[PDB]
Ligand binder design. Structure first.
Ligand SMILES: Cc1cc2nc3c(=O)[nH]c(=O)nc-3n(C[C@H](O)[C@H](O)[C@H](O)COP(=O)(O)OP(=O)(O)OC[C@H]3O[C@@H](n4cnc5c(N)ncnc54)[C@H](O)[C@@H]3O)c2cc1C
Ligand SMILES: Cc1cc2nc3c(=O)[nH]c(=O)nc-3n(C[C@H](O)[C@H](O)[C@H](O)COP(=O)(O)OP(=O)(O)OC[C@H]3O[C@@H](n4cnc5c(N)ncnc54)[C@H](O)[C@@H]3O)c2cc1C
Lengths: 566, 566
């Protein structure tokens, strides 16, 4: 066997890598130990960035037609049981009109609810169609690196055979216990994730629309520990989660209690368990090996950043491998994979963990014990209806506590979108870092400075709305400018013919292909109309010029050659 | 390797077979020579029967959320070009209110538009998830049958290795040039399909909603030969088809002419060719080999019966192999596969071909030549606007001709649903064949007589509509009766414990789990309320009793033992 890139793993990171590589004409052989694509629903939250990437390749429309949309996952209800009395609700997943606006202004896509069970196979099938060899029931065993590529040993669970595959690079998208990471010797840190804890999940079917329809929500939390009624399909498919474990028909009981009532005909599906040693990789790259996904970041499910962050890891490295394999870019370009993705890995492991320190306070608000029994939790409901000044501080305390839990339920827009890149793959412009005017975890800050992702705004084509993001991507470099920067079209030519690289230029303005109809691009560019913003295949701005002056024009070439390593 | 059933092919028939077998707990290893699932859109029409089967397994909702629905494929427009003048339209795919009612009354599902490109992978991924081993890039080379199973030789296009797989049965779902059919020696007939002719298909993208939206249609025919603008995704994705061929950028020209105007920005995709030696197999079964799909029926694309008929071939044989492999049924049960599916194979090859003799008359109506040039076809448009009595006969002639083309565009409801089974797997009741009151190709006739598929009617559960079909299926035998046939619950028990077979009984009536709310079941059963209708896992009624009399009750056992071959 001989492939350009061996992809170990077919989950979110692997499938995406194979689809993008194929889309770029690079031969890749993605493997996966199991029969199917994952069985449980696992991850479910799809953030804007993941959507954008789905939109770039043409998989958004299908994605949206298998997901629950944003309007059905805004009611986060804290209660005793589903059929019980509530404590309160929070506007989850940017439901609050303010949060919704900030959401809508940051990108043309929007939160949706798509379980991994359906997302996986959509991407695996597309990778194959796009020309990426796929092969399940084949496990990676190890590899040996050498100066011209790698050879790896594969076990085939169908024939029982064993074989080698020669590849130029390997992508370690093999999960939480990456054998690829262990072989490459990648250092891991921040294991302080407390005491290694797991979760137990149970699937079951019931028709609980009568207790959902009027208050449509992605999840219904129960205080019972902090159990959780997560919707899989509205409102007939479910799952309970709570905090390596055996259970039986008794689970049906647990649920009947989690539903409060035992009258909706329930059908108990599979029962899994999930453990996690919270850690990141300090480095994601060793020689010709690159890891990504849970293979570089392992953490809690708070904020659902794991599947999203993993697809973004694949987006950042695909075009890069493709440019290097085609000889248009020097192998150095690959060094920025670690530079740009590694800080994202550590950032999310810590944030996902920090969010776990927001729930506990809801208990302390009900002046309760973590191991509340019944009377205790029934006496809390009483103390809460108290008509005294001390009942007010109390109710106020509980509202405060619950509202503090939003950062882990749709409130961390900054965390999802505020990616700042520093590396050879980004050509600095000379300006200083502007900062964040407001909290960088909670609110997103749009920025055209090199290192940041393009900012969304709407534009028009045939008088129909198109987003700045639609103009770019496509496995190519993008240059955006206006009418007065006409000179950018030629520069770009001279710098593309000479560098053997594709470089699409768009001159936005009146009577042009794309038009600044609402004047919003002029508003969000942070530069004259004659300036230019170079956009990488992954949507990040690496180069920014303030005008079309000879000294601004001459710099393009220096930036591209620099970004490519030549 | 060792599997219970080797499935050669992963298209519609193979994927479905693997999903159903898995669903029945039978170990199956489905293979496929290619990388992906098919690339072109190929088949696109999904008939009611295919839907029903999707609904039984739980894949209807997903299917419906990737398809164009019935309301967008009712306007069949005959024109010069898309942007030209029309000759006329026909109500395709049961759009006509009368046809729509007959459609809606025959089943709880409805025509939809889902290309094979999306349908394939939905079913392949589900088969894997359900526990069916899948493996592409593996080709079948041949096999040797022996009295206890078969051994087949496989070529692996990934490792280059060659290996054997031992299986009890093989399912030849390998297409139009089935190597499995040739090895099993299956006789083929009715090659008279005239002179072997092909079609050329071309994909392209344009935004032609401005010339579709007001007249939503599955296809736009152009008279140019009989070209055809088929929609893939409304209304940006397309394909032209017309009557082994090379073409280039010039195709873009062909289309610009097929669109009439050259102003919509067009993007030329792939260009394939499709050939077909019209033939059926006289027998579909040899020893331990069973063929299905195009491997048993090859024909034109008129009436889109091929993909539907192929899924139905898999539905008919899955439960059967499962009962035999579990030792609950004698190997003889498998003999009815040929008895019941074989006549369907010949019926559709001939019908698909006959439909090709309905188009030609539209020309003779315009008093034209098959090879019309331009002036000729422009002079036809003139002769058509003539204000004479001879212009009237003419316009009337053309309307007649076009309306005759409906049998191949949604008019053959009988053909899609009028399956009559005769075999050991059906226990006759003693009544004679009732016939069809109206044309058996055009209109469907519901019939509770053994050998026919359950008739759809609505019933209620929790006051919510459920279709008689929903009560049955599930890889099990189903007995339907009413309040006065209470005795059927016990009989069924005695006959299920003793035969080691699952047999669900439903007593439909007032205050029961299912209720004849609209009295429609009482109306369509053709028997007393005390009677019973036994339904096979494939939705076909094999046994029918007129009442709960001791002589009617005692017969159940004799029928089940007979249907199973014991
Ligand atoms: C049970 C469970 C429940 C979860 N629930 C949630 C949730 O509710 N919310 C949330 O945000 N996140 C959840 N996660 C985490 C989430 O699944 C990850 O963030 C996401 O799957 C990362 O994608 P990945 O492809 O990197 O991981 P994976 O998809 O696990 O990548 C590894 C894949 O490669 C294959 N593979 C592994 N080892 C080998 C080998 N040696 N050889 C060949 N192939 C191999 C495996 O088939 C595996 O599918 C859950 C994880 C698990 C396990
Ligand atoms: C180009 C094209 C266009 C078409 N367009 C239409 C249309 O517009 N309308 C319509 O109604 N019908 C159309 N058809 C016919 C339609 O595709 C068939 O009715 C349908 O595909 C039947 O399903 P199947 O799985 O039996 O066929 P297939 O899916 O072809 O079954 C064979 C499959 O098994 C695999 N296989 C084959 N040989 C081997 C081997 N030796 N070893 C291992 N694996 C093997 C192949 O990968 C192949 O996918 C078209 C067919 C083609 C080829």
């Amino acid at each position: 066997a001989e492939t350009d890139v061996l992809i170990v793993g077919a989950g979110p990171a692997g499938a995406m890598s194979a689809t993008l590589l194929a889309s770029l004409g690079i031969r890749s052989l993605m493997i996966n130990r199991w029969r199917s694509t994952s069985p449980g629903p696992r991850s479910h939250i799809i953030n804007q960035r993941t959507m954008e990437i789905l939109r770039d390749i043409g998989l958004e429309e299908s994605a949206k037609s298998l997901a629950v949309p944003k309007e059905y996952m805004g009611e986060h209800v804290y209660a005793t049981s589903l059929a019980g009395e509530e404590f309160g609700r929070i506007p989850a997943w940017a439901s609050h009109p303010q949060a919704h606006a900030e959401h809508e202004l940051a990108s043309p896509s929007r939160y949706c609810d798509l379980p991994q069970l359906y997302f996986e196979p959509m991407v695996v099938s597309e990778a194959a169609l796009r020309g990426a060899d796929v092969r399940f029931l084949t496990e990676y065993l190890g590899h040996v690196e050498d100066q011209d590529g790698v050879t790896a040993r594969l076990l085939d669970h169908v024939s029982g055979a064993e074989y080698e595959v020669r590849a130029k690079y390997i992508i370690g998208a093999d999960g939480a216990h990456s054998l690829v990471a262990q072989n490459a010797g990648l250092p891991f840190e921040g294991q302080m994730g407390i005491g290694d804890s797991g979760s137990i999940n149970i699937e079951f079917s019931a028709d609980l629309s009568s207790l959902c329809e009027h208050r449509k929500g992605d999840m219904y939390w129960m205080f019972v520990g902090v159990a959780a009624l997560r919707m899989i399909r509205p409102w007939n498919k479910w799952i309970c989660v709570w905090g390596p474990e055996i259970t039986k028909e008794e689970a049906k009981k647990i649920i009947h209690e989690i539903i409060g009532t035992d009258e909706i005909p329930v059908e108990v599906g599979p029962i899994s368990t999930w453990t996690i040693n919270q850690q990141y990789a300090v480095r994601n790259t060793s020689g010709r090996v690159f890891c990504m996904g849970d293979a570089v970041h392992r953490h809690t499910p708070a904020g659902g950043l794991g599947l999203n962050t993993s697809v973004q890891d694949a987006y950042n490295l695909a075009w890069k491998l493709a440019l290097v394999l085609k000889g248009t870019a020097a192998p150095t370009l690959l060094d920025s994979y670690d530079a740009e993705r590694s800080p994202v890995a550590k950032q999310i492991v810590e944030r996902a963990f920090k969010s776990l320190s927001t729930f506990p306070p809801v208990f302390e608000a009900l002046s309760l014990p973590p191991a509340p029994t019944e009377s205790e939790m029934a006496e809390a409901l009483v103390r809460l209806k108290d008509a005294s000044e001390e009942g007010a501080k109390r109710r106020a305390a509980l509202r405060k506590a619950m509202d503090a839990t939003i950062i882990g339920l749709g409130g961390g827009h900054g965390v999802e979108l505020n990616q700042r890149y520093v590396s050879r793959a980004v050509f600095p412009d000379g300006t200083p870092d502007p900062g964040f005017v407001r909290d960088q975890e909670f609110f997103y800050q749009a920025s055209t400075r090199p290192g940041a992702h393009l900012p969304h705004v709407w534009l028009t084509e045939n008088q129909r709305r198109i987003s700045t993001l639609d103009l770019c991507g496509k496995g190519r470099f993008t240059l955006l400018t206006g009418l007065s920067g006409a000179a950018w079209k030629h520069e770009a030519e001279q710098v593309s013919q000479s560098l053997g690289i594709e470089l699409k230029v768009c001159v936005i303005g009146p009577g042009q292909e794309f038009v600044d109809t609402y004047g919003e691009y002029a508003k969000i560019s942070e530069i004259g109309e004659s300036g230019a913003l170079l956009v990488r295949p992954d949507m990040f701005i690496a180069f920014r010029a303030k005008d079309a002056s000879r000294e601004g024009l001459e710099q393009l070439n220096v930036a591209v050659k620099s970004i490519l390593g030549r």
